[PDB]
Amino acid sequence: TGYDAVDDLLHYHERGNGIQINGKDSFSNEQAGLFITRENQTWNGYKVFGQPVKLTFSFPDYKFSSTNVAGDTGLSKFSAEQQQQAKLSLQSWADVANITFTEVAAGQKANITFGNYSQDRPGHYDYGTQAYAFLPNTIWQGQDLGGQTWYNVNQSNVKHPATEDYGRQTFTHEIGHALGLSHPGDYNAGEGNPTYRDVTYAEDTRQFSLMSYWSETNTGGDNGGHYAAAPLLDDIAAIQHLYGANLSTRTGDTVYGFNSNTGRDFLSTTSNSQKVIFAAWDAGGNDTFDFSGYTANQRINLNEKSFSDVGGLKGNVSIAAGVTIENAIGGSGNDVIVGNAANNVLKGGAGNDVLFGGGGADELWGGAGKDIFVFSAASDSAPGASDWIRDFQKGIDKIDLSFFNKEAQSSDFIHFVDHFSGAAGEALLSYNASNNVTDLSVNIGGHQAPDFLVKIVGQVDVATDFIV
Numbered sequence: 317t318g319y320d321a322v323d324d325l326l327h328y329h330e331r332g333n334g335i336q337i338n339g340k341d342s343f344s345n346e347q348a349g350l351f352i353t354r355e356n357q358t359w360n361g362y363k364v365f366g367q368p369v370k371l372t373f374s375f376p377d378y379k380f381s382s383t384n385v386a387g388d389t390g391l392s393k394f395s396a397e398q399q400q401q402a403k404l405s406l407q408s409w410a411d412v413a414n415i416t417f418t419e420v421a422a423g424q425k426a427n428i429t430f431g432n433y434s435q436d437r438p439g440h441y442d443y444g445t446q447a448y449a450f451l452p453n454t455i456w457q458g459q460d461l462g463g464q465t466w467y468n469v470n471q472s473n474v475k476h477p478a479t480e481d482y483g484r485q486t487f488t489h490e491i492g493h494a495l496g497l498s499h500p501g502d503y504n505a506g507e508g509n510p511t512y513r514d515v516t517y518a519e520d521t522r523q524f525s526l527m528s529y530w531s532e533t534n535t536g537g538d539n540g541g542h543y544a545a546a547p548l549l550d551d552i553a554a555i556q557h558l559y560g561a562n563l564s565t566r567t568g569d570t571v572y573g574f575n576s577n578t579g580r581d582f583l584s585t586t587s588n589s590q591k592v593i594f595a596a597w598d599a600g601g602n603d604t605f606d607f608s609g610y611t612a613n614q615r616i617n618l619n620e621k622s623f624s625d626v627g628g629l630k631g632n633v634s635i636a637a638g639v640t641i642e643n644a645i646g647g648s649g650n651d652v653i654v655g656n657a658a659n660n661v662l663k664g665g666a667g668n669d670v671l672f673g674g675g676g677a678d679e680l681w682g683g684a685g686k687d688i689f690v691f692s693a694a695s696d697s698a699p700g701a702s703d704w705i706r707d708f709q710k711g712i713d714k715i716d717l718s719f720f721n722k723e724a725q726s727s728d729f730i731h732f733v734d735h736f737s738g739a740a741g742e743a744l745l746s747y748n749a750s751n752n753v754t755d756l757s758v759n760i761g762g763h764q765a766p767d768f769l770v771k772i773v774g775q776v777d778v779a780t781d782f783i784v
C-alpha cells in the first residue's frame with residue numbers, strides 16, 4: 317500500500333532512544349553534535365559555547381626547504397585552484413554557524429592558514445599521508461598551533477580539489493578541526509588499526525558527518541562513489557553548538573537541486589548525472605526541494621532531521637534540526653514524497669508516485685502515471701484547511717485510507733454512505749459536475765460533523781479509486 321511506503325520512509329534511519337544498530341549505540345543528532353565537540357575547544361575560549369566568532373585566514377607563501385611544526389617539509393603555497401576550493405569550503409561553514417571569515421595577506425598573521433607539504437624528511441616524498449590540522453588553543457612551546465591546516469600535495473585529490481571531490485571534502489574536514497571539531501570517535505581501541513568496528517556510536521559514518529572516516533555504507537547510505545563537499549547533519553549540530561546557528565542564511569524563497577537559486581555548487585545540479593549530497597540549512601522563506609531532473613526512483617522526506625534517497629543515491633539528502641522545507645518536486649521515476657506539518661506543494665512528476673501531505677493544507681499533484689495519495693489522520697485534511705488533489709484521474713489514481721481500518725482492525729470502520737448519520741467511519745463523496753470538484757468527507761472522530769475533508773479536482777470512482 318501507499319501507506320506502507322510512507323511508514324517505511326518515516327522510520328528511515330531512526331536514532332537515539334535505546335536503539336542499537338551495528339551492535340553499537342545510536343546517538344541522536346544532538347548527542348552526536350556534543351560528542352564531535354567533546355574537546356570543548358573554541359576560538360572563543362575553552363567551554364565557551366554559542367557565541368559568534370570572527371576569523372581571518374590566509375595562504376602563506378611557504379619555503380620548500382622549510383619545516384613545519386609537525387616535521388614535514390617540501391612546503392608550498394596553495395595554488396589558485398586550491399585557494400578557490402578552500403574558500404568554498406570556508407563559506408559552507410559560514411552558512412550554518414555564526415562565523416565570519418576574512419582573507420588577510422600572505423604576510424600577516426591569520427587564525428586559519430592553509431599550506432601544502434610533500435616530504436616527511438628532506439629529499440623524501442611522502443605518498444602515504446593526506447592532511448592534518450590543529451584545533452583551537454593547541455599550545456606548543458608557548459605558541460598556539462590552532463588554525464593551521466596542512467595537506468599532502470603529492471595526493472591528486474589535494475592538488476586538484478575542483479575535480480576530485482575527496483579533495484574538497486578534505487578541505488572542509490580540516491577546516492572543521494581548525495574550528496574545534498574532532499573525529500566522532502577516538503578509536504583508541506586495540507591499537508592504531510582502526511575500523512568502523514572501533515566507533516563509539518553507530519552514526520559515525522560519512523552519511524552523518526564529514527568528520528568521520530567511515531563509509532556511509534556502514535549505516536545503509538550509498539553516495540555512489542562520491543563525497544559530500546559541505547557539513548553534514550551531525551556536523552551542523554556540532555558547529556551550531558560552538559558558534560550558534562546562522563539565522564541569516566537563505567531567508568528568502570529557496571530552491572535546492574534543479575533550478576537552484578542557492579549560489580552553492582553543493583546545493584545545485586544541472587543534470588541527471590550531477591548527483592547531490594547535502595544537509596540543508598535554511599533560516600526562512602518558502603522553499604523547495606526540486607529533484608525534477610532525476611530519473612531514478614526517489615524518496616523525499618520534508619521532515620526535520622530526516623533522510624531522502626535522491627538522484628539514485630541512498631540517504632544522501634537530509635534536513636537540519638530547526639529547518640522547515642515546504643515543497644518537493646519528484647522526477648520521472650516512481651517516488652515517495654512525504655511532507656511535514658506545514659502547508660506543502662508536493663508534485664510527483666511522471667512515474668507511479670506515493671504522496672503524503674501530513675498536517676496543514678497541502679496541494680497535491682500526482683503528475684502523469686498511476687499515483688496514490690495517502691492519509692492517516694483526520695488532521696491531515698481538516699475542514700477549514702483542506703488538502704487539494706489538483707489532477708486526480710479516475711480509474712487511474714488512488715486514495716489510500718488503509719491506515720484507518722488497519723488500526724481499527726475492522727473491515728467496516730471506514731465505509732461509504734449516501735448520507736451522514738453521525739456514525740464514526742462514515743465516508744461520503746460529493747461530485748460537482750459544473751465545477752469538476754469532488755468532495756471527500758469522512759467522519760473519523762464520530763462528531764456531529766465530519767472531521768476530514770479533501771477537495772479533489774476531477775471525478776473519483778468509488779468502485780475503483782480507493783484503498784481501504
Ligand SMILES: [Ca+2]
Pocket residue numbers: 565566567568569570598599600601602603
Ligand atoms: Ca529559504
Ligand SMILES: [Ca+2]
Pocket residue numbers: 598600601602603640641642
Ligand atoms: Ca522554509
Ligand SMILES: [Ca+2]
Pocket residue numbers: 646647648649650651664665666667668669
Ligand atoms: Ca515521479
Ligand SMILES: [Ca+2]
Pocket residue numbers: 664665666667668669682683684685686687
Ligand atoms: Ca506521477
Ligand SMILES: [Ca+2]
Pocket residue numbers: 655656657658659660673674675676677678
Ligand atoms: Ca503538510
Ligand SMILES: [Ca+2]
Pocket residue numbers: 682683684685686687709712713
Ligand atoms: Ca496520475
Ligand SMILES: [Ca+2]
Pocket residue numbers: 673674675676677678695696697703
Ligand atoms: Ca495536509
Ligand SMILES: [Zn+2]
Pocket residue numbers: 489493499527
Ligand atoms: Zn581529521
